[PDB]
Design an enzyme around this catalytic site. Structure first.
Site, PDB file in Angstrom:
ATOM      1  N   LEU A  18       0.852  -1.361  -0.092  1.00 29.21           N
ATOM      2  CA  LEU A  18       0.144  -0.152   0.117  1.00 29.21           C
ATOM      3  C   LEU A  18       0.889   1.299   0.020  1.00 29.21           C
ATOM      4  O   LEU A  18       0.634   2.306  -0.700  1.00 29.21           O
ATOM      5  CB  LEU A  18      -1.003   0.070   1.318  1.00 29.21           C
ATOM      6  CG  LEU A  18      -1.826  -1.158   1.444  1.00 29.21           C
ATOM      7  CD1 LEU A  18      -2.270  -1.320   2.826  1.00 29.21           C
ATOM      8  CD2 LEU A  18      -3.072  -0.996   0.291  1.00 29.21           C
ATOM      9  N   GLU A  20       5.050   2.863   1.818  1.00 29.98           N
ATOM     10  CA  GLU A  20       6.382   2.757   2.420  1.00 29.98           C
ATOM     11  C   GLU A  20       6.633   4.242   3.014  1.00 29.98           C
ATOM     12  O   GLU A  20       6.690   5.182   2.354  1.00 29.98           O
ATOM     13  CB  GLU A  20       7.394   2.201   1.657  1.00 29.98           C
ATOM     14  CG  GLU A  20       7.777   3.114   0.378  1.00 29.98           C
ATOM     15  CD  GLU A  20       8.526   2.374  -0.486  1.00 29.98           C
ATOM     16  OE1 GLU A  20       8.585   1.035  -0.504  1.00 29.98           O
ATOM     17  OE2 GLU A  20       9.264   3.143  -1.359  1.00 29.98           O
ATOM     18  N   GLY A  21       6.876   4.102   4.411  1.00 27.81           N
ATOM     19  CA  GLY A  21       7.263   5.470   5.090  1.00 27.81           C
ATOM     20  C   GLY A  21       8.244   5.272   5.707  1.00 27.81           C
ATOM     21  O   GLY A  21       8.706   4.916   6.800  1.00 27.81           O
ATOM     22  N   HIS A  22       9.804   5.713   5.119  1.00 30.03           N
ATOM     23  CA  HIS A  22      11.044   5.795   5.602  1.00 30.03           C
ATOM     24  C   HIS A  22      11.759   4.593   5.817  1.00 30.03           C
ATOM     25  O   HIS A  22      12.546   4.036   5.019  1.00 30.03           O
ATOM     26  CB  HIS A  22      11.048   6.744   6.735  1.00 30.03           C
ATOM     27  CG  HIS A  22      10.194   8.042   6.543  1.00 30.03           C
ATOM     28  ND1 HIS A  22       9.461   8.182   7.358  1.00 30.03           N
ATOM     29  CD2 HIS A  22      10.004   8.948   5.582  1.00 30.03           C
ATOM     30  CE1 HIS A  22       8.761   9.627   7.127  1.00 30.03           C
ATOM     31  NE2 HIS A  22       9.446  10.041   6.112  1.00 30.03           N
ATOM     32  N   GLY A  24       9.575   2.170   8.187  1.00 28.16           N
ATOM     33  CA  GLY A  24       8.247   0.929   8.099  1.00 28.16           C
ATOM     34  C   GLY A  24       7.609   1.017   6.831  1.00 28.16           C
ATOM     35  O   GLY A  24       7.510   2.063   5.913  1.00 28.16           O
ATOM     36  N   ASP A 133       4.277  14.833   9.920  1.00 24.60           N
ATOM     37  CA  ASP A 133       4.187  14.201   8.754  1.00 24.60           C
ATOM     38  C   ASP A 133       2.728  14.470   8.144  1.00 24.60           C
ATOM     39  O   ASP A 133       2.179  13.469   7.524  1.00 24.60           O
ATOM     40  CB  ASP A 133       4.481  12.673   8.863  1.00 24.60           C
ATOM     41  CG  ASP A 133       5.037  12.048   7.485  1.00 24.60           C
ATOM     42  OD1 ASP A 133       5.105  12.962   6.531  1.00 24.60           O
ATOM     43  OD2 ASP A 133       5.437  10.946   7.387  1.00 24.60           O
TER      44      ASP A 133
HETATM   45  C1  LIG Z   1      -3.406   2.405   7.076  1.00 26.83           C
HETATM   46  C2  LIG Z   1      -4.222   2.058   5.913  1.00 26.83           C
HETATM   47  N1  LIG Z   1      -5.426   1.209   6.031  1.00 26.83           N
HETATM   48  N2  LIG Z   1      -6.141   1.280   4.828  1.00 26.83           N
HETATM   49  C3  LIG Z   1      -5.066   1.579   3.844  1.00 26.83           C
HETATM   50  N3  LIG Z   1      -5.464   1.922   2.573  1.00 26.83           N
HETATM   51  C4  LIG Z   1      -4.573   2.551   1.847  1.00 26.83           C
HETATM   52  O1  LIG Z   1      -4.631   2.797   0.405  1.00 26.83           O
HETATM   53  C5  LIG Z   1      -3.401   3.091   2.388  1.00 26.83           C
HETATM   54  C6  LIG Z   1      -3.098   2.842   3.788  1.00 26.83           C
HETATM   55  C7  LIG Z   1      -1.819   3.513   4.142  1.00 26.83           C
HETATM   56  C8  LIG Z   1      -0.552   2.969   3.602  1.00 26.83           C
HETATM   57  C9  LIG Z   1       0.871   3.253   4.311  1.00 26.83           C
HETATM   58  C10 LIG Z   1       0.857   4.792   4.111  1.00 26.83           C
HETATM   59  C11 LIG Z   1       1.969   5.522   4.670  1.00 26.83           C
HETATM   60  C12 LIG Z   1       2.651   6.594   4.089  1.00 26.83           C
HETATM   61  N4  LIG Z   1       3.007   7.463   3.590  1.00 26.83           N
HETATM   62  C13 LIG Z   1      -0.302   5.575   4.532  1.00 26.83           C
HETATM   63  C14 LIG Z   1      -1.646   4.959   3.783  1.00 26.83           C
HETATM   64  C15 LIG Z   1      -3.945   2.132   4.528  1.00 26.83           C
END
Ligand SMILES: Cc1n[nH]c2[nH]c(=O)cc([C@H]3CC[C@H](CC#N)CC3)c12
Length: 283
Positions: A18, A20-22, A24, A133
């Site tokens: 979905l 990637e953050g640095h 994690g 952020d």
């Molecule tokens: C939690 C999360 N729960 N459901 C979701 N559906 C998504 O498409 C994306 C997300 C998240 C994926 C991770 C990103 C981090 C950043 N930059 C934020 C967004 C989530």
């Protein structure tokens, strides 16, 4: 006895990445015990191959946050090494959603999303935390009428008898979403998060177009290819008094409240509860 927040690693099966953050990385996974693809779809944050203490601190922050415009903690998946299990919003972030759904989402709905972010951030700020952020990529879409803040990877607690968090590590920081005192002095306030909302609000009003993103627009002003000097150039531009321009088809009454989020000194900057009163007046 069975703890519902205790997710076994063996049952947890991946679907896709979905975001990637640095350090994690967040992956979509189906938690399916019975083993017939009928399991609950959950967002699964975990470390990219230490920052275990940072993720453990992030987990304990999110577990104790209870709010409608904040993503739900579902559980954890624990040898050492830990994974954060969150709820899955299928519509995704504003970065992915807003370009694909310009027809559904109008100015009236955009300001409702904007209020909902502030309500989440004011709740966060009132609980002695600082986000560090706030951008459209971290703002999720529950439904067409509801948004949530879906990442707290850089979220830190404000220290004892102090009005800011002294930032140590800042290798991959969103400099174009960051206020001058965060860039210059490297000390992050709650008033800093208001600046970050202001840029998130600009992102929201532009429907998260990459060609007119905050990075893209600032780079057009300051210069596209300066590299290491980009951040010091970026400050010097903000010192002169040069902000992001008003989006196309955005009112001046909206843009003026966005401009109040980018006052130079944090002491004379607007707040989230103030912004809620401002947006609701227009609604
Ligand atoms: C939690 C999360 N729960 N459901 C979701 N559906 C998504 O498409 C994306 C997300 C998240 C994926 C991770 C990103 C981090 C950043 N930059 C934020 C967004 C989530």
């Amino acid at each position: 006895e069975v703890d519902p927040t205790h997710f076994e690693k063996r049952f947890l099966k991946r679907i896709r990445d979905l975001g990637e953050g640095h350090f994690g990385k967040v992956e979509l996974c189906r938690y399916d015990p019975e083993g017939d693809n009928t399991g609950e779809q959950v967002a699964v944050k975990s470390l990219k191959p230490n920052h275990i203490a940072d993720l453990k601190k992030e987990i304990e922050i999110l577990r104790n946050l209870y709010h409608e415009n904040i993503v739900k903690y579902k559980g954890i998946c624990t040898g050492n090494g830990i994974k954060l299990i969150m709820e899955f919003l299928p519509s995704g972030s504003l970065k992915e959603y807003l370009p694909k759904n310009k027809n559904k989402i109008n100015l009236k709905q955009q300001l409702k999303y904007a209020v909902q972010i502030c309500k989440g951030m004011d709740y966060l700020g009132s609980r002695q935390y600082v986000h560090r952020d706030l951008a459209a990529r971290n703002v999720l879409v529950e439904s067409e009428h509801q948004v949530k803040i879906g990442d707290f990877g850089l979220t830190k607690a404000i220290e004892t008898d102090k009005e800011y968090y002294t930032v140590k590590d800042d290798r991959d920081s969103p400099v174009f979403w960051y206020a001058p005192e965060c860039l210059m002095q490297s000390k992050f306030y709650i008033a800093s998060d208001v600046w970050s909302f202001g840029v998130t609000l600009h992102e929201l009003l532009t429907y998260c177009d990459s060609d007119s993103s905050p990075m893209a627009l600032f780079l057009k002003m300051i210069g596209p290819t300066h590299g290491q000097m980009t951040v010091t150039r970026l400050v010097n531009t903000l010192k002169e008094g040069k902000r992001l321009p008003c989006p196309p088809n955005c009112p001046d009454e909206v843009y003026q409240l966005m401009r109040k989020c980018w006052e130079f000194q944090p002491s004379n900057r607007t707040s989230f509860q103030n912004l809620i009163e401002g947006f609701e007046a227009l609604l």
